[PDB]
Specification:
The structure is cut from a larger assembly and holds 2 copies of chain A (108 residues), 2 copies of chain C (333 residues) and 1 copy of chain D (305 residues). In chain A, 44% of the residues lie in helices and 0% in strands. Chain A is built from 5 helices and no strands. The two termini of chain A are 25 Å apart. Chain C is of the alpha+beta class and 333 residues long. Chain C folds into 2 domains: 110 residues, no CATH class; 223 residues, no CATH class. Chain C is built from 8 helices and 14 strands. Chain D has 305 residues and is of the alpha+beta class. Chain D has 2 domains: 178 residues, no CATH class; 120 residues, no CATH class. In chain D, helix 1 packs across helix 2. The longest helix of chain D is centred in the first third of the chain and has 19 residues. Chain D is globular. The chains are: A mainly alpha (108), C alpha+beta (333), D alpha+beta (305). Chains in contact: A-D, B-C, B-D, C-D, C-E. Chains C and D meet through loops of C and loops of D. Strand 2 of chain B pairs parallel with strand 9 of chain D, so a sheet runs across the interface. Chain E binds 3 DNA and RNA strands through strand 1, strand 4, strand 5, helix 5 and strand 18. It is classed as immune system/rna/dna. The entry lists the keywords inhibitor, complex. The Csy-AcrIF14-dsDNA complex. Chains A, B: Type I-F CRISPR-associated protein Csy1.
DNA sequence: AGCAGCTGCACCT
DNA sequence: AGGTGCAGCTGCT
RNA sequence: CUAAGAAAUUCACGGCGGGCUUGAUGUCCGCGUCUACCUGGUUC
């Protein structure tokens, strides 16, 4: 629960602090983090710039953050075969369930 | 007090070392006569002089360079608070801190 | 009646820390994206050049002592090697209500002081003191060593009412000297604004920018800090210069000292020019103190004779008492 | 000490040269007694004429830097001092030490008055923010607006008017513009239960603040004990050590129309939280209470968790 | 009468840090977009080569110490392999007002000190000192080890008034030696300009570029930095070179030391080259002090006899005192 | 014909 | 980049 | 009505001379990515 809030504050102060956000290296691949933890429109705001990340469904970022969180909490047959890995996955699910509601009230 | 008197406090501070007459310098003069080796008036003057360490010794006053803040009452006027410096609490915390920093068991 | 045992005044005319950036002349009107100057480090090595002792000179010992030099590491700040000028920016607010103390013990001393300040303001305004305070904004005394040797210093001052500019002022800081106080047709509007803000209604906000054409790659002089040093084998000092967010800066009290250089009425001479308004008026770059208490021209005895015994001094020396009431301080019996 | 009728934002207060030491035992952020005294002074200078009451304060620290230095690679820090004027004889003066800091904070206030009903909200918010930008908060002056940016105008959120879903969406709206930093709350019950857990050795409470502001490692018969957050030792009011005097008794008093008392600090525990992880925004607010029969003058944050 | 207890002066010749870049000869007129010289690092493996104390100079100890090599990492700066010239560029400004101190306690001392300096400047101008100062910009002495063994050195000097060029000078730095002070017709215009700056009647800002033809890929020599930790055997960094934003450079005090190599008046010799002006004029490479205080020819003896007792110390030695005042420092007690 | 002040010196961990 | 207490002195009274 | 109220750290400076980092080397074996779909966004 503390590790979620540190990432929230780092996304709120890191990209939001610097007043610049150019095109990412490899924009076909570096666009998920550049869309989620990215700023609003700027001087390079094209026609499909202010109508792409604010109009699209901002709910893939929760599963993308859960995919990063799955690496930190190690899983295997030692935990998945027991009944503690199910609760250890359900706690991360209950934490990342608010990641689309608290992390999706800006654009949508 | 003044610094020039501080060495005299050493003569008032040796009564807790070796002997047990640290409270025997002024009153209970059985240890203050065979070890004092004086008359009765000299013993009375010494008992009056060494008992003045623990006295009040001052009229209740403050200064213009002290703090004196205001504090609000529940639905009334105010109170003037004059905070002082906790010498003894600071000395106790300092003695608890330097031993944890360096000492016998902390270094072992 | 007597003097209150607890007496205190609050600082009016408080500035902020000024920030330093760099760029080129004839683009100074678009100087909002100019990059900041930064503090770096370098190493120096010198030899014995101090006035050594009167009997330990010893012409074989000086040769043996010259072979071991000194070695340091210092902080330093320069302009970039393509930038021409230096920009110094700060803000100032005038606070108003310059007669009322922040703390006073008696109720009779308080009203006697109140009516004394009331007769002063009713007889003459704050116009002389504001005309002298606006000079150190019209010229650029607040850049201390950055003003020496420059070929062009200009100052832009703008007044801020809402989130927009109400009025603007542009000066040429090298024409207005550092010795006399003369009244121009443009300095009087700023003096009237400072005098209206100093009379009690609220606060008045100004923003002061100074541009100094200093060279190209030359070094600049921010404030340096006072620390109690390290004392080990490592490098003890860096001759540390002051920074806000990786940008070289000047302190607030140094600019406040530069704005206060007012009184030419001290009884030594006006050969040193104006000094800063202090009780027992002393100069740190001079080692000594004018306005000694052996004469009757310090702050305490003048206020004691003006409030208690009711003998008003000369109209020149009436400005000095109001000046270090605007300055502030803690005084007690 | 009621639930406030409205909340008042003060969005980004930049303070220069505040007081850093704040206690005879700590040196970090300034004490919250400064913030409660600031809002009481603001009440005395505005709310008597605008017919409102201000009692609560919420301290969200956006950023913080201190005038400190690091000597010789030692594991300590010192304070950068200022240069005082010369003496009367003209040699030098003795040095007293004080620490200064540059902070940027936000303050949410609670309004209980009846002035809300007869006047527009934005006028009250604008007049409070305009009057607040002319005095100081912690010994350091409040810096005004800078050019080339859009400034933040403060708003008046209404708490006791509306539906509950609209309430929760307004409280989720106002937490958007105050998330960069964190909030500070008090933890008396947590310190009490942690004293009662390890009470089998020594029941002195002062050896508990000095057991949570350290890094304790009892290794294997390499592990670090799980810190539940960011626990900091703070000053938590005053405690008297002298009887109450009369308005003329003590000389050199600040005012000769108010009784005086000598006083020691009291030390408690506090915590820095993210603003998302609270239920409502009125749980944060700091209040102060006095028991003049005793000597207990204490500020704390009630109605939190 | 005695000397004041606070007496400080500031420097009147301000140079900057001299940055270096590289290119090809016969294109030095288009050398504005030449790329800079960068600092790299490499590995060295040395052997023992110092004197042995003949206490542990055994036949087996030396062979044992040979097998354990010392491995270090050093910084190095070379020219590119398609470029043969080095270009060094800096700016300089001459301030003037070289008699008035920066701080002074006594007012009876500073008035007669200003009287002494004023009778010097009225008796003879700044022409000799400015001639000897312009010589050290003509022959490129500020390239210290980048000047030995060079094929050709050429120096351009500009005069800047606004963002324009007022006058230009070109010199062959190898024809003008490092020994004599011989007057040309083109060097005297530069000497007149530097004296006009030092006197106070004008603002003087110069920029100096020096080209040195060395060879393709050869090694250049920037300023060397202090390494705080003791040199440690087996891979420790051993030397570091000075830099600005990814470009090698020379310190400002090192190219300032090569401008005040002026005085030939020291009593040891005059045909062994000019040395730098200093109190107790000393070379740290030689390990000795000319102008010992046992004679009467150091700065603190001549200054204290010229002001306190009014004993002029001969025209030749009067340029030494004024050059020391142009240098700066804290004199007195 | 003394009050008040003031300077300067010494003591001390 | 010491504070406090006392011996001595002045000086016009 | 805020551990409230107050404050100039400054003047000058040559880091520097030398150097051999080397000698050998096997990354191997095996594998099912499948099912669906109107751009008639306003590629201004």
């Amino acid at each position: 629960g503390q590790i979620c809030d540190e990432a929230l504050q780092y996304a709120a102060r890191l990209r939001e602090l610097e007043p610049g956000w150019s095109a990412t290296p490899g924009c076909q691949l570096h666009d998920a983090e550049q869309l989620w933890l990215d700023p609003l429109r700027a001087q390079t705001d094209e026609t499909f710039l202010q109508r792409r990340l604010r109009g699209d469904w901002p709910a893939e970022v929760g599963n993308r953050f859960a995919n990063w969180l799955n690496r930190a909490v190690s899983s295997d047959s030692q935990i998945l075969g027991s009944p503690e890995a199910a609760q250890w996955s359900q706690e991360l699910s209950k934490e990342l369930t608010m990641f689309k509601e608290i992390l999706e009230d800006e654009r949508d | 007090g003044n610094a020039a008197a501080l060495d005299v406090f050493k003569f008032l501070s040796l009564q807790y070392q070796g002997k047990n007459l640290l409270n025997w310098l002024t009153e209970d003069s059985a240890e203050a006569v065979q070890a004092l080796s004086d008359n009765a008036e000299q013993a009375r003057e010494w008992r009056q002089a060494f008992i003045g360490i623990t006295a009040v010794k001052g009229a209740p006053a403050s200064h213009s360079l002290a703090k004196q803040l205001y504090f609000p009452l529940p639905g009334s006027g105010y109170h003037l608070l004059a905070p002082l410096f906790p010498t003894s609490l600071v000395h106790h915390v300092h003695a608890l801190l330097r031993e944890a920093r360096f000492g016998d068991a902390a270094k072992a | 009646l007597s003097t209150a045992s607890v007496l205190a005044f609050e600082r009016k005319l408080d500035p902020s820390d000024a920030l330093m950036s760099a760029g080129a002349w004839a683009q100074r009107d678009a100087s909002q994206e100019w990059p900041a100057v930064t503090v770096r480090e370098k190493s120096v090595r010198g030899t014995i050049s101090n006035r050594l002792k009167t009997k330990d000179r010893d012409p074989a010992k000086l040769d043996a002592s010259i072979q071991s030099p000194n070695l340091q590491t210092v902080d330093v700040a320069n302009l970039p090697s393509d930038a021409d000028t230096l920009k110094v920016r700060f803000t100032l607010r005038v606070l108003g209500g310059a007669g009322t103390p922040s703390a006073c013990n008696d109720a009779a001393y308080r009203d006697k002081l109140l009516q004394t300040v009331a007769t002063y303001v009713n007889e003459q305004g704050f116009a002389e003191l504001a005309r002298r305070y606006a000079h150190n904004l019209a010229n650029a005394r607040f850049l201390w060593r950055n003003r020496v040797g420059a070929e062009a210093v200009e100052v832009r001052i703008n007044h801020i009412r809402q989130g927009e500019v109400a009025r603007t002022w542009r000066f040429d800081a090298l024409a207005i000297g550092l010795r006399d106080f003369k009244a121009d047709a443009e300095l009087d509007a700023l003096a009237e604004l400072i005098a209206s803000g100093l009379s009690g209604s609220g606060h008045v906000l100004l923003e002061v920018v100074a541009f100094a054409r200093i060279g190209d790659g030359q070094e600049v002089f921010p404030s340096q800090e006072l620390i109690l040093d390290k004392g080990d084998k490592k490098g003890q000092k860096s001759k540390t210069l002051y920074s806000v967010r990786d940008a070289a800066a000047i302190h607030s009290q140094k600019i406040g000292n530069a704005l206060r250089t007012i009184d030419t009425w001290y009884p030594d001479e006006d050969g040193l020019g104006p000094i800063a308004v202090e009780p027992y008026g002393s100069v740190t770059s001079q080692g000594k103190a004018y306005r000694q208490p052996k004469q009757k021209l310090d702050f305490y005895t003048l206020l004691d004779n003006w409030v208690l015994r009711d003998e008003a001094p000369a109209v020149e020396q009436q400005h000095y008492v109001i000046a270090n009431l605007i300055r502030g301080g803690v005084f007690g019996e | 000490v009621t639930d406030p009728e409205a909340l008042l934002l003060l969005p980004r207060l930049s303070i220069q040269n505040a007081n850093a030491i704040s206690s005879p035992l700590t040196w970090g952020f300034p004490s919250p007694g400064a913030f409660t005294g600031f809002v009481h002074a603001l009440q005395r200078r505005v709310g008597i004429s605008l017919d409102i009451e201000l009692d609560g304060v919420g301290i969200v620290c956006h950023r913080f830097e201190a005038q400190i230095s690091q000597p010789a690679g030692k594991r300590t820090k010192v304070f950068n001092l200022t240069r005082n004027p010369l003496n009367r004889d003209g040699s030098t003066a003795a040095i007293v030490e004080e620490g200064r800091a540059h902070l940027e904070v936000s303050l949410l206030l609670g309004v209980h008055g009846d002035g809300l009903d007869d006047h527009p909200a934005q006028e009250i918010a604008r007049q409070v923010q305009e009057q607040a930008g002319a005095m100081r908060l912690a010994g350091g002056s409040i810096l005004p607006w800078c050019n080339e940016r859009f400034p933040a105008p403060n708003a008046e959120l209404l708490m006791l008017g509306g539906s509950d879903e609209q309430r929760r969406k307004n409280q989720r709206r106002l937490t958007r513009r105050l998330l960069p930093g964190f909030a500070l709350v008090s933890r008396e019950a947590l310190l009490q239960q942690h004293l009662e857990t390890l009470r089998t050795t020594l029941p002195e409470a002062t050896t508990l603040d000095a057991l949570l502001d350290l890094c304790r490692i009892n290794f294997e018969p390499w592990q670090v004990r799980d810190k539940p957050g960011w626990l900091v030792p703070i000053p938590a009011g005053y405690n008297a050590l002298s009887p109450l005097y009369l308005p003329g008794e003590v000389r050199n008093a600040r005012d000769r129309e108010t009784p005086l008392r000598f006083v020691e600090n009291l030390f408690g525990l506090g915590e820095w939280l993210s603003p998302h992880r609270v239920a409502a925004l009125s749980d944060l607010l700091w209040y102060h209470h006095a028991e003049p029969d005793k000597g207990l003058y204490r500020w704390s944050t009630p109605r939190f968790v």
